[PDB]
Amino acid sequence: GGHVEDVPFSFEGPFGTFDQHQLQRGLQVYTEVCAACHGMKFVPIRSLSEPGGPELPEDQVRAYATQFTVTDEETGEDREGKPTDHFPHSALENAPDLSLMAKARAGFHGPMGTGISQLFNGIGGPEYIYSVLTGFPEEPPKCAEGHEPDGFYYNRAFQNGSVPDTCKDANGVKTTAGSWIAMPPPLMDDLVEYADGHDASVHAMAEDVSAFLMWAAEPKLMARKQAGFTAVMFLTVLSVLLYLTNKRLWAGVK
Amino acid sequence: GGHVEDVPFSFEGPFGTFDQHQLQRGLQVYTEVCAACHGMKFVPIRSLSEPGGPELPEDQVRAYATQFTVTDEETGEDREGKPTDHFPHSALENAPDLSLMAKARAGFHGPMGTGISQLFNGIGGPEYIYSVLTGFPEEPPKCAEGHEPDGFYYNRAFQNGSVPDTCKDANGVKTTAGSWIAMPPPLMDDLVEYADGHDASVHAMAEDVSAFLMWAAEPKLMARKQAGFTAVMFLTVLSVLLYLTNKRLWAGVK
Amino acid sequence: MSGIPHDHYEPRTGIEKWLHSRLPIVALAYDTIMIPTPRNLNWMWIWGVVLAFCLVLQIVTGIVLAMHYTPHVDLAFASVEHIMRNVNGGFMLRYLHANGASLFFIAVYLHIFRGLYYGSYKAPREVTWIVGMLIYLAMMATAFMGYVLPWGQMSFWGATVITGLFGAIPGIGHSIQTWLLGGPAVDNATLNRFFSLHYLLPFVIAALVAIHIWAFHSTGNNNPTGVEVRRTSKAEAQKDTVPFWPYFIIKDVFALAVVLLVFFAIVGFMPNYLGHPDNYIEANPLSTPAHIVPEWYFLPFYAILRAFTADVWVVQIANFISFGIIDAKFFGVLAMFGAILVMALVPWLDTSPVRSGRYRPMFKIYFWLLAADFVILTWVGAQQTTFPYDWISLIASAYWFAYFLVILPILGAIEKPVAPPATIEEDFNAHY
Amino acid sequence: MSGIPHDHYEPRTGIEKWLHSRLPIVALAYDTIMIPTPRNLNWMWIWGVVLAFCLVLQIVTGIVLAMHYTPHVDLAFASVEHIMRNVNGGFMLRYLHANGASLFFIAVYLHIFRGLYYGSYKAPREVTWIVGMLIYLAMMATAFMGYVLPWGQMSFWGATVITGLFGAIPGIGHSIQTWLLGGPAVDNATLNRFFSLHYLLPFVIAALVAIHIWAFHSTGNNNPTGVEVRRTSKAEAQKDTVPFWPYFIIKDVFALAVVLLVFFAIVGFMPNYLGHPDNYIEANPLSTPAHIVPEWYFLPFYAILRAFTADVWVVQIANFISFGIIDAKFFGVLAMFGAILVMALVPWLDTSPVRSGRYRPMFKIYFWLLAADFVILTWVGAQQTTFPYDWISLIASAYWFAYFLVILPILGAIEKPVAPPATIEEDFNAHYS
Amino acid sequence: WKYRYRLGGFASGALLALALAGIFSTGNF
Amino acid sequence: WKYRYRLGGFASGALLALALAGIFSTG
Amino acid sequence: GTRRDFLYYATAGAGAVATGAAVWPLINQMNPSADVQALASIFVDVSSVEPGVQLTVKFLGKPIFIRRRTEADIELGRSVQLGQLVDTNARNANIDAGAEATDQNRTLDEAGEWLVMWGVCTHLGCVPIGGVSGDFGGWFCPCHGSHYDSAGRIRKGPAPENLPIPLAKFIDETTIQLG
Amino acid sequence: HAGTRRDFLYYATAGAGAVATGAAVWPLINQMNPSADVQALASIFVDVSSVEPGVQLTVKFLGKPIFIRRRTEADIELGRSVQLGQLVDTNARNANIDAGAEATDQNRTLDEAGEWLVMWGVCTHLGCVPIGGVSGDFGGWFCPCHGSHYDSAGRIRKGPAPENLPIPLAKFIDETTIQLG
Ligand SMILES: CCCCCCCC/C=C\CCCCCCCC(=O)OC[C@H](COP(=O)(O)OCCN)OC(=O)CCCCCCC/C=C\CCCCCCCC
Ligand code: HEM
Ligand code: HEM
Ligand code: HEM
Ligand code: HEM
Ligand code: FES
Ligand code: FES
DSSP states (O other), X not given: OOOOOOOOOTTOSTTOOOOHHHHHHHHHHHHHTGGGTOOOTTSBGGGGGSTTTTOOOHHHXXXXXXXXXXXOTTTOOEEEOOXXXXXXXXXXXXXXXXXXXXXXXXXXOOSTTOOHHHHHHOOOHHHHHHHHHTOOOSSOOSTTTTOOOTTOEEESSOOSSBOOTTTEETTTEEOSSSEEESSOOOOOTTOSOOTTXXXXXXXXXXXXXXXXXXXXXXXXXHHHHHHHHHHXXXXXXXXXXXXXXXXXXXXXTO | OTTOOOOOOTTOSTTOOOOHHHHXXXXXXXXXXXXXXXXXXXXXXXXXXXXXXXXXXXXXXHHHHTTOEEEOTTTOSEEEOOTTSBOOOOSSTTSOOOSSXXXXXXXXXXXXXXXXXXXXXXXXXXXXXXXXXXXXXXXXXXXXXXXXXXXXXXXXXXXXSBOOTTTBOSSSSBSSSSEEESSOOOOOTTOSOOTTOOOOSHHHHHHHHHHHHHHHHOTTHHHHHHXXXXXXXXXXXXXXXXXXXXXXXHHHHO | OOSSOOOOOOOOSHHXXXXXXXXXXXXXXXXXXXXXXXXXXXXXXXXXXXXXXXXXXXXXXXHHHHTTOOOSTTTHHHHHHHHHHTSTTHHHHHHHHHHHHHHHHHHHHHHHHHHHHHTTXXXXXXXXXXXXXXXXXXXXXXXXXXXXXXOBXXXXXXXHHHHHHHHTSTTTHHHHHHHHHSSXXXXXXXXXXXXXXXXXXXXHHHHHHHHHHHHHHHHOOOOTTOOOOOOSOHHHHHHHEEEIIXXXXXXXXXXXXXXXXXXXXXXXXXXXXXXXGGGGSBOOTTOOOSOOOOOGGGHHHHHHHHHOOTTSXXXXXXXXXXXXXXXXXXXXXXXXXXXXHHHHXXXXXXXXXXXXXXXXXTHHHHHHHHHHHHHHHHHHHTSOSSTTHHHHHHHHHHHHHHIIIIIHHHHHHHOOOOOOOSOHHHHHHHHO | OOSOOOOOOOOOSHXXXXXXXXXXXXXXXXXXXXXXXXTTOOGGGSHHHHHXXXXXXXXXXXXXXXXXXXXXXXXXXXXXXXXXXXXXXXXXXXXXXXXXXXXXXXXXHHHHHHHHHHTTTSTTTHHHHHHHHHHHHHHHHHHHHHHHTTOBHHHHHHHXXXXXXXXXXXXXXXXXXXXXXXXXXXXXXXXXXXXXXXXHHHHHHHHHHHHHHHHHHHHOOOOXXXXXXXXXXXXHHHHHEEESTTHHHHHHHHHHHHHHHHHHHHHHHOTTSSSOGGGGSXXXXXXXXXXXXXXXXXXXXXXXXXXXXXTSHHHHHHHHHTTTSSOHHHHHHHHHHHHHHHHHTHHHHOOOSOOOGGGOTTHHHHHHHHHHHHHHHHHHTTSOSSTTXXXXXXXXXXXXXXXXXXXXXXXXXXXXXXXXXXXXXXHHHHHOO | OHHHHHHHHXXXXXXXXXXXXXXXXXOOO | OTTXXXXXXXXXXXXXHHHHHHHHHHO | OTHXXXXXXXXXXXXXXXXXXXXXXXXXTTSOOHHHHHTTOOOOEEOOOOSSEEEEXXXXXXXXXXXXXXXXXXXXXXXXXXXXXXXOBOOBTTSOTTOBOOHHHHSSSSSSOEEEEEOOOTTTOOOOBOTTOSBTBSEEOTTTOOEEOTTSOEEESSOOSOOOBOSOEEXXXXXXXXX | OOOOOHHHHHHHHHHHHHHHHHHHHHHHHHTTSOSSGGGGSOOOOOOOOSSHHHHOOOOEETTEEEEEEEOOSSHHHHHTTSOTTTOOSOBOOBSSSSSOOBSOSSSSBSSSSOOEEEEESSBTTXXXXXXXXXXXXXXXXXXXXXXXXXXXXXOXXXXXXXXXXXXXXXXXXXXXXXXXX
């Protein structure tokens, strides 16, 4: 993963939480745009009503579910989707499944492999997702304008792509910060209308989907934070009372 | 099934073995007649070439497999059968799978719940199969001469079937020995042309196919008996040596 | 060690002395194998070694089979057929594990009835008896969950019935049932957790067996006379006893070998006789087979469960006085557990001072009646619930309970026992 | 037991009379827990209790997870998602188990380096050291097989690399690899047998730990001075010792509570930091990740493995003299095992009679070099095998062998140790006057 | 009497552990 | 000389088990 | 002073809770997971059948019976008086909880032709074998020999309760909703 | 005769117990050897077609994709239009040939007549299945995972690193069509 813009998402840090509205916006954008190619085969549709997620009402989740056509795993007949179904697999064969992409990508590295950057900044998966979505320039790098691979697009964040020979340094080393990706620039200004009138810039939509994809990768992050706090409190109290008991005991021998 | 015919089969007893030619005849009978309705989803077709079975040449098994065609996992589409494929599922959903039928049925019972009949006669599985195949009489029991079910056929070996209330008893349970089975009488004399010129009577074909289904249920009966003999010999030698050791050792304590 | 006068281990080889000064593992092993053992033991004492063998066999075959089984309701039956059909020796390994569970329950029923006859549960041996009861309960759970694993028709409907038993507990029972199931029905959650627990519990059984061995070493072995080894001196102890190695090690290994000759003969030539054909049918939640019969070692308890129908007078009384809190369902479940509970309490219910039953001329009768009753309970378990088998099973269950709760307390108050020998040496000499 | 004068258990209450006469389990427990322990132990003696806890944590979380995981390639990753997503607390149970493996390995490395410094491997404790090494090897195998179980990209390709090492062994290696895998390649038979063996080995580890605890109860604890407790009398023994309960039980449970406070902070607020993100990608046997890194506690041995190549002079010599039977691949595999073996043999390689490194003024330098070198191997194992990391890896690997095979044998001839204090009581009173 | 110092210890530990975990469940630091 | 009977016995008992389990079961 | 063992019990308390709070999740993870919770409600509709035979339909992991009873079984003289049953409750989700175990309160229709039930024996959950098995018509449970009459009412054996009637209603004369 | 000695008898019993052990252990480790997997070496018979992307298939063998390629209408032409000195990855590196050869266009083939050649679809120097279909401008393959292009002969010239698309055991090829054995 290429070096990301350090987006200040609201869920970061021990007290960070998901904004339900931002999650709903990201879900909307995913539904209107990304679901054309990317699946979420590990995400159960019923999770849309789960506490700490979008918390859509159950009838609205049911309405949402019915838009999908599901080959019934027992009947073989095609039917409307149900909340107990998962999101479809990726319709486009080479589009990666997004159920875990916000965990399956690191945006921060090193320095020198020491990992301290990931220690402070976290893994940076949402920031990577945002950087890819924001990473299509208005025009290619000035080098090798005659050699762009057909059917691919330059992205500043993507590092796994093909690179023209003319852009490779003689050592086989990438001169460009980015590389060419098969993903066409997916977002466009005001592409999705937020009914509340929220900002529909590409940056806003990219952030909202990055937050939604973070929730898709860790729906129970909130509960993990709360268990973390309650455990830390129990072990703090236990630590202090054991320290005082140890001190009282060992004072008796010296 | 009660009062199954105790057919002598060559594989019976500890020295019993499969007749390879009887197995090939049973395979032919199954393939031409029975395989239309029933399947053998647990039997790998390649096993027809393996020792102790029909032991067909691998090129013949490959030709045999090509008669099938299967929805291959990699192509998602109908693809001609290969020896690594299994036999197909039952084409008629009503018809049970035969892969284990010769083990899943008891022909012998009691006396008086003691299990001694099974202790001498064995489980009676292929004997039960033969009795069911041979079990269709020429004439119904005449208790429901105008009153028997239409979609079902009386069989004197089958016990789980429906019974007409004129044949049924409240005081007892059931007048007739058998019951009515949904399977039409499957065999007819000379229905299968044995290229060997062997007897193709209903009796002979029923024996041959029952032996084939026995091999289908226990394809390694031969190896199991060989291992039985080997272990019995080792434990006999060890038991005699341990007896003489114990006697010569305890003769000191006298 | 045991309180029998004995020679302690003495390291003599250089490596022996180097190790013994650092870890007395060899000293403990020597003490374990050299324990002075009563010389008058008969063939009923072999079953402890056969039980250890059965445990080792079932563990090792489980571990091997666990490399190929798949604990999923779409794959379990197919993976068992894969074991039966493709794996090198897999058919034999599976028939070994399946018949070994029967061998194991045979050896524990003979070990139990030995202990009951010779009074091996009496003081000071109540603790080794209790550890034995824990071992037996763990074996029962292990074998049940193992039998659920093939996901045949019998596996599925057994898993259904047995989880219903916990549902029978008034009030909380539905919670325990749904916690065992993980849901409203037997499904993949049940199979997968039953696999995990069937893997776990044999190691618990092994640790309990280790504690059982330590317990009986700590008391010393009982013997057919029930007279203790003379503790006075080495010279007297050596007359009453002989070292366990080699004499009884070789005796037990001989008996094990001759038992396994029949075991491997069965596994070779008739491995399906003890099983159920219906478990070769894939589980079908929509139709129960017409031959619902537990694996044979559970049949006495299944018989006791079935014996108490709602018309049984004691059940009606209990239902009345409980104001409906007890019913035939819950009464039957309580009885089916009481059958084991009351057997665990036998060290305290037997009031008699005399240890060995062979000097108890009335006790012999009720004991052999109990053994016949246990056979009847096994046999009635396989029969239908119609007349007369309802009466037979009810009478059998009543005698089972009456033996522990009435007959044993009375006999110790009224029996006129014979005088046992003065010493084990005397008995051994009298028999040569 | 240990030879230290001590009070045996006597049953007090009637119930204690009834049990103790029948089964001395309470007596054994008392004799274990009341063991007289040197007064001068420092915080480096906590790690055994941390390890004992970690074994319980791993066992109980594994058993819980084993109720929900499915060992099949079509279902394993999906069942791990089911754990993360539908099971009550299943996310925490997984993260606890995965980070608890790292906790377990850092604790064993601390416990080993404590032993290496204070000389707890020396006579009469060689058996305790050997049992420790067996425990460590069983942990290594357990953790590897466990890391294969989730069947991500890193699980599959790491297994494919590591199982490839057995393929290096001349002649038999192809048979050994095939028997391990159950085929030519990492596949469902590998996942299922690895699941079975991963369930099995924790109980074998627990048995070895029981033998380990019996071994040290059979020798008594070492202490920072290396000076043994006075066997002469109960008076002198008590002057040198205090009972393990309550003093050191409460000390170690306090230190455990602090270690678990930091562990649960990690598990709460950053559980994915130790993991590898590519293991959130399903195994794709066609498409290798850009860089396969085995997880951190394997890296120093994987570093040693990669550090030797046909470019290396000693490898060229080994190839020449072996007629190419020792190719660089098998040389590297032999080195990777030799690194663990030579640490196992350390009770016989350190010739010096002085036990504690505290009094060995030159040994301290080479020990702290070995510690830095272990850190360098851990870090270099993650780096790409180009210049200069090839040099840093080769030099570190060479120093690892040079420490056990050369420096330790020579120091026992050359070193001029300080004189230890006369007794543990003196050393204790010197701090706590 | 004596036991209420023990039991009061028992009770004191209970409320203190629960209350502090409750406070942090308000998430307001 | 020593190991006359001990070694000879061991090999005899081993081979005999291998013989009588093989040939009579196979033939 | 005694504040020593005050402190020692406070630390012991913090300990026993820290362990106690660790143990409960190991139990609660076996309670029904949110997917199994979600399957607790399902919608389905099922069609017509000839008289004298029964269907079966899966729901909630268990069978639903649908029998269209014979003339002999819709009538049975209605001979069973309410005072000779074992269980006198209708066990019917479609009517009040004070309903009695009467033939018409068991059936779904007014004539008594249509009887819809859980196919689950109220003893321990086995499927009762139907046709006209048992000694009172109706069904017979093979597992412990409980007998149900033609109305699915418990007559003999270990079962405590009549076969429960799920929430179900006709949509058309040809089909019946279950959810 | 055998000796009358007791220790003779004792050691004979130890021998019988030793072999009764060894014959019991071997099945427990043998079962871990391949079982159903040995039939992964299937015969891969297919119906014929002319034209290279017609009959030729990415078909799975040894659990992994393969290419079997008649040098029909592009591969022999381009094979007769790429020099041995143009290729990078040199040695024949081939199991169906007996011994090495430099950068050879044929002898990658089953036959010295060189009418069929075969290679693993699983491009193995890292891991990919490069897109065949005679595509890539030497008429061979190109790798989306890695960016190499391949000779129609299955041999590397352009790309980050030189390894040829590797050659498995194949022959017989008799029914005008894909076959293995
Ligand atoms: C299988 C391994 C299981 C391990 C379980 C460990 C559990 C730890 C949880 C609590 C233990 C906490 C520390 C207790 C320290 C006691 C120290 C001690 O030895 O003294 C006992 C001390 C007497 O002192 P002396 O022996 O005379 O002098 C000491 C110097 N010779 O006895 C006491 O009066 C204090 C005993 C403390 C409680 C012991 C019983 C604990 C059982 C249950 C209590 C838990 C209640 C929890 C309530 C929940 C509250 C949130
Ligand atoms: C895993 C199964 C078991 C094993 C491996 C085992 C092991 C042993 C062994 C080796 C002995 C000594 C030799 C002998 O008496 O045969 C023994 C004795 C005994 N066992 Fe078991 N046992 C098992 C189960 C049981 C059970 C289920 C019970 C009863 C509930 C039981 C109760 C006893 C008793 C009372 C003794 C006699 C002890 C004495 O003589 O002092 N054991 N056991
Ligand atoms: C106390 C020792 C054990 C007992 C009494 C026992 C009993 C059983 C029984 C009765 C079955 C059913 C077999 C059948 O009839 O089809 C079974 C199956 C099974 N057991 Fe065990 N078992 C034991 C140990 C183990 C262990 C330790 C493991 C795991 C390592 C294991 C793994 C399995 C598996 C995978 C199956 C299903 C495959 C099969 O059919 O064999 N078993 N067990
Ligand atoms: C020595 C103690 C143990 C160690 C060091 C250990 C280590 C590990 C590791 C490192 C993983 C990979 C975690 C990941 O990154 O996904 C794992 C997974 C796993 N372990 Fe363990 N383990 C231990 C004990 C156990 C036990 C006793 C079981 C019981 C069967 C078990 C069952 C599992 C299962 C099912 C998985 C895969 C599912 C998952 O947790 O992700 N483990 N183990
Ligand atoms: C499962 C992991 C292990 C556990 C639970 C364990 C347990 C223990 C415990 C409780 C102690 C006493 C307290 C202490 O000294 O910290 C101890 C000491 C010791 N351990 Fe371990 N150990 C483990 C692994 C190892 C390893 C990997 C080694 C090194 C190869 C090792 C070598 C030693 C030595 C030399 C001692 C000192 C013995 C003495 O002082 O006489 N242990 N161990
Ligand atoms: S389970 Fe249905 S009658 Fe008992
Ligand atoms: S792996 Fe495709 S040529 Fe590089």
